C-alpha cells in the first residue's frame, strides 16, 4: 500500500542520517593515538593447578567474588564448586536436565544459577541450615534456549534466550518485571556494567544493542560484524566493550562514540571465537578461539602477545579473577586449567 | 598430612568422598543408549513415541536388559546450528518420514509439496559435519494409506521422471531408493530402512537390532580388531 511505501522510505532516510552523523565524528583512529606507547613483551603463562573430575564437555564457568572459589558446568549433569587454592571440591550439585549452556555465581556468594536448552533458569542456595544444597526458585516463560544469565543483585537476575528476547526477573515473586525486545537473531551472550545500570547483548544478526535496566528500553545499536556474535564483555572502565564473532574477528566498540575502534584478526586464523575477557587493567584481551587454544591480544596495539595451548579440544569458557591474579580456562576435554 | 592442620585433613577427606561419588555416578550413565528423534512435521513422530512408550522431551524405556533414552527436540523453534553440536555423542539417529504425503501441498507455498521438504531436511541432517559417523534409522510411516492413494492419483506428480507399474511395491521401492541415494559417504555411515507395521513389537525389535550392530562396530574399532 501507499502507507507501507512511505513508512519504509522514512525508515531508510533515518539510517542514512545516522550513518552520516556517525562518520562526521571519525576525526582520528585509536591506532594513531596509541602508536607511541611501548609494546608489551611476550606474555608467558603456566598451568599452576589442573582441575579434573568432569566426564563431559564443559560449557560454562564463573569465578567467585572472593577470587578463590569457582563453579563449572558440564553436560554430564553435575555442577561442581572448586577451591582453586587447594584443588579440593566443596560442593557437587546434580542437575535435573543434563543439557546446560550457562551458569552464574552470586556476588554475595549465597546462590548459584544455572540453565540452558530447557527454557527454565534454576537458583540453588549454598548456605542452608540443613547443610545440603536445594533449589530455591525456578524461572520460566522463555520460548528458547537460554544463552546467558547474570546476577544483578541478591534479588534480581537478567537472562537472555534464543527467541530474540531478554527479560529481568524477580526471585522473590518469580515473575518477569521487564522484557527487552528488538533483536532479529538469537541472543548468544550478555555482560553487565560495573555499576549494574546498563548491559549489552549480542545476537545472531551481527548486531549489539545497549539496554537500560531501569527504563527497560533500548539505547544504542552497534553493527559491523559479518556473522554470528558469540561473546561480549565490558571494559573495566565501563565505557567500552569487546565482541567475538564467528568470522575469526574480534572488535572493540565504544559507548560515547558509536564507531569501531580496533579489529583483532590474523590471516593464519580462520576459526571462530567462543569466549572474550579482559584483564584487571584492561590492557590484555583474552579471546578463546575454537582451534584448541587461546590467544592474548593487546587492547591498545591489536598485536598478539601470547598463546595458551594446553587443551586438546575446543575452548568454550574463560574467566579472570577480580584481583587479576590468575585466569581459568575450560574446554571440551573435561579439564579446567588455572594459568598464572 | 605433614603440614596440613586438623581442619585441612577433614577437608581433603570430604573431597575424596565427592570424587568417589562422581566416579560411581559416572559409570552408571556409560551403559545407556542415547537416541535422537527427528522429523519433518506431521510425519508420525508422535505415533512412533506411543509405539514404544513405557523445550526438549526425554523418554526412557528398557528392552532386553538394555536401557534406551530418546530425546525429542522438534519443539525448540530456534536456530538448528547453534545447539546441534550438543547431540554429538548419540549412538544413532531415528528419522521419521511419511510416504503418503506425496500429494499434499505445503501451507506456506502451494507449489511446494511436503514430500520434497522431508527430502531436503534428510539431506541436511545426513550430510552434517557433526554426524560423519552416526548411523541413521529411517522409518516410513503411514504406509497403509499409501496403497489407496496410489491408485486414484499416480505418483508422477512428485516424480515426473518415473515410469513404473503404478503398484504399491514398485512405488515404495522407488521412494526408498530416492531417500537412500541422498547419502554422500557410503563408507562410514549406514542407513537402515524399515516400514512401520500396525503392531509395536516389530518396530522395537528393529531398533534393538540396529543399535546392537552399531555397538559392535564401535567395539571392534575401539579394540583395534577392525
Amino acid at each position: 500500500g501507499s502507507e507501507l511505501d512511505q513508512l519504509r522510505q522514512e525508515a531508510e532516510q533515518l539510517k542514512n542520517q545516522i550513518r552520516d552523523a556517525r562518520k562526521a565524528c571519525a576525526d582520528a583512529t585509536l591506532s594513531q593515538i596509541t602508536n607511541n606507547i611501548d609494546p608489551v613483551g611476550r606474555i608467558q603463562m603456566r598451568t599452576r593447578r589442573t582441575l579434573r573430575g568432569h566426564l563431559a564437555k564443559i560449557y560454562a564457568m564463573h569465578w567467585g567474588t572472593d577470587s578463590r572459589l569457582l563453579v563449572s558446568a558440564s553436560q554430564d549433569g553435575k555442577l561442581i564448586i572448586w577451591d582453586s587454592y587447594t584443588t579440593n571440591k566443596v560442593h557437587a550439585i546434580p542437575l535435573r536436565s543434563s543439557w546446560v549452556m550457562t551458569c552464574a555465581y552470586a556476588p554475595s556468594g549465597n546462590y548459584v544459577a544455572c540453565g540452558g536448552l530447557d527454557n527454565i533458569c534454576s537458583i540453588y542456595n549454598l548456605k542452608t541450615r540443613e547443610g545440603n544444597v536445594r533449589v530455591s526458585r525456578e524461572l520460566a516463560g522463555h520460548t528458547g534456549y537460554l544463552s546467558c544469565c547474570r546476577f544483578l543483585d541478591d534479588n534480581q537476575i537478567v537472562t537472555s534466550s534464543g527467541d530474540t528476547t531478554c527479560a529481568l526477573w524477580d526471585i522473590e515473586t518469580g515473575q518477569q518485571t521487564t522484557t527487552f525486545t528488538g533483536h532479529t537473531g538469537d541472543v548468544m551472550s550478555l555482560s553487565l556494567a560495573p555499576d549494574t545500570r546498563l548491559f549489552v547483548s549480542g545476537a545472531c544478526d551481527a548486531s549489539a544493542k545497549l539496554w537500560d535496566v531501569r527504563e527497560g528500553m533500548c539505547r544504542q545499536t552497534f553493527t559491523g560484524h559479518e556473522s554470528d556474535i558469540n561473546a561480549i564483555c565490558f571494559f573495566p572502565n565501563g565505557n567500552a566493550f569487546a565482541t567475538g564473532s564467528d568470522d575469526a574477528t574480534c572488535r572493540l566498540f565504544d559507548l560515547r562514540a558509536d564507531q569501531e575502534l580496533m579489529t583483532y584478526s590474523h590471516d593464519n586464523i580462520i576459526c571462530g571465537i567462543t569466549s572474550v575477557s579482559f584483564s584487571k587493567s584492561g590492557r590484555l584481551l583474552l579471546a578463546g578461539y575454537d582451534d584448541f587454544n587461546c590467544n592474548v591480544w593487546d587492547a591498545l596495539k591489536a598485536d598478539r602477545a601470547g598463546v595458551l595451548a594446553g587443551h586438546d579440544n575446543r575452548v568454550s569458557c574463560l574467566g579472570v579473577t577480580d584481583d587479576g591474579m590468575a585466569v581459568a580456562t575450560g574446554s571440551w576435554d573435561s579439564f579446567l586449567k588455572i594459568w598464572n | 598430612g605433614c603440614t596440613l592442620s586438623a581442619e585441612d585433613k577433614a577437608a581433603v577427606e570430604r573431597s575424596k568422598m565427592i570424587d568417589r561419588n562422581l566416579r560411581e555416578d559416572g559409570e552408571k550413565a556409560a551403559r545407556e543408549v542415547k537416541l535422537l528423534l527427528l522429523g519433518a512435521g506431521e510425519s508420525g513422530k508422535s505415533t512412533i513415541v506411543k509405539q514404544m512408550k513405557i523445550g526438549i522431551v526425554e523418554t526412557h524405556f528398557t528392552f532386553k536388559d538394555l536401557h534406551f533414552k530418546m530425546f525429542d527436540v522438534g519443539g525448540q523453534r530456534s536456530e538448528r546450528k547453534k545447539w546441534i553440536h550438543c547431540f554429538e555423542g548419540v549412538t544413532a539417529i531415528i528419522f521419521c518420514v511419511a510416504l503418503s504425503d506425496y500429494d499434499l501441498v505445503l501451507a506456506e507455498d502451494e507449489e511446494m509439496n511436503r514430500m520434497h521438504e522431508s527430502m531436503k531436511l534428510f539431506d541436511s541432517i545426513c550430510n552434517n559435519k557433526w554426524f560423519t559417523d552416526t548411523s541413521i534409522i529411517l522409518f516410513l510411516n503411514k504406509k497403509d494409506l499409501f496403497e489407496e492413494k496410489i491408485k486414484k492419483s499416480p505418483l508422477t506428480i512428485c516424480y515426473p521422471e518415473y515410469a513404473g507399474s503404478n503398484t504399491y511395491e514398485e512405488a515404495a521401492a522407488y521412494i526408498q531408493c530416492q531417500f537412500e541415494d541422498l547419502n554422500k559417504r557410503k563408507d562410514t555411515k549406514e542407513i537402515y530402512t524399515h516400514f512401520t507395521c500396525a503392531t509395536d513389537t516389530k518396530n522395537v525389535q528393529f531398533v534393538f537390532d540396529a543399535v546392537t550392530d552399531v555397538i559392535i562396530k564401535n567395539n571392534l574399532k575401539d579394540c583395534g580388531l577392525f
Partner: single-chain antibody, 232 residues
C-alpha cells in the same frame, strides 16, 4: 534441627553402659560428630570424634582404649560404649555436630545433654579470671591464654568462643576467633593475637549471664579453658 540423647543413669563401678543420640532435621550422613564431657561444678573436656563415613576415629588420651564410638548413617544414630567406668567417670555428656569445608562453622549445634553417675606437648588453656561482678549497660572483656601459637601457616587461628547459660546447653558464639556465628547479635566480638585472646561485649543485657569457655582446634586432643562466670 535437633539432637536427642538418652542412656544415662546410675551404674556400679563394675559394669558397662552405652549412650545413644538421635539426629533429625539435617543431613546426618555428611556431618562429623564429637562427644563432650562436662564434670559437675567443673570444666568440660573433649572425649572422642568420628568423621563422615567412619574414616578417622580419634580418642582422648585420658580414656584411650576404653571407650568405643560407632556411627549408623541409615538410622541417623550415633553410639558410644564404655566398658569399665571408674569413680572419675561421672559427668554430663553432650553431642556436637561439625562439618569441615572452606567457610564452614564447626561446633554449631550442641544437643541437649545427658547425665551419668557412678557410685563410690599438649596445649593447655588457662583463664585467670573466675568471677567478676558487672552491671548491665557497660562493656565486658574476657581474656583467655594459651601455651603455644595457634596461628597456622595458612593464616587461620583455631580458637572458638562459646557461652553456657545456667541450665542450658552451650551455644557457639565465635569460631576461628574472628567470625561471628549465625543467630547471635552483633554486640559480641572477638579479637586476639599470638597467645592472648579477648572477647568483648559492647552492650550488656540480662540474657548475657553465663559461663565463657575458650577452645583450641589446632591439633588433637582438644583442650578447653577454665570456666569464667559473670554475676548480674
Amino acid at each position: 534441627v535437633q539432637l536427642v540423647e538418652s542412656g544415662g543413669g546410675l551404674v556400679q563401678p563394675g559394669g558397662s553402659r552405652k549412650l545413644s543420640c538421635s539426629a533429625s532435621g539435617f543431613a546426618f550422613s555428611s556431618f562429623g560428630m564429637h562427644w563432650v564431657r562436662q564434670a559437675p561444678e567443673k570444666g568440660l573436656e573433649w572425649v572422642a570424634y568420628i568423621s563422615s563415613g567412619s574414616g578417622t576415629i580419634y580418642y582422648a588420651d585420658t580414656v584411650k582404649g576404653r571407650f568405643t564410638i560407632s556411627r549408623d548413617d541409615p538410622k541417623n544414630t550415633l553410639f558410644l560404649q564404655m566398658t569399665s567406668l571408674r569413680s572419675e567417670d561421672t559427668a554430663m555428656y553432650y553431642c556436637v555436630r561439625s562439618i569441615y569445608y572452606y567457610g564452614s562453622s564447626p561446633f554449631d549445634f550442641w544437643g541437649q545433654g545427658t547425665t551419668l553417675t557412678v557410685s563410690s606437648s599438649d596445649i593447655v588453656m588457662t583463664q585467670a579470671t573466675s568471677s567478676v561482678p558487672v552491671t548491665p549497660g557497660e562493656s565486658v572483656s574476657i581474656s583467655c591464654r594459651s601455651s603455644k601459637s595457634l596461628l597456622h601457616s595458612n593464616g587461620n587461628t583455631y580458637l572458638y568462643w562459646f557461652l553456657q547459660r545456667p541450665g542450658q546447653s552451650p551455644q557457639l558464639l565465635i569460631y576461628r576467633m574472628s567470625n561471628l556465628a549465625s543467630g547471635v547479635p552483633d554486640r559480641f566480638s572477638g579479637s586476639g593475637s599470638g597467645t592472648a585472646f579477648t572477647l568483648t561485649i559492647s552492650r550488656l543485657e540480662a540474657e548475657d549471664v553465663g559461663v565463657y569457655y575458650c577452645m583450641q582446634h589446632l591439633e588433637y586432643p582438644l583442650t578447653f579453658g577454665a570456666g569464667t562466670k559473670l554475676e548480674l
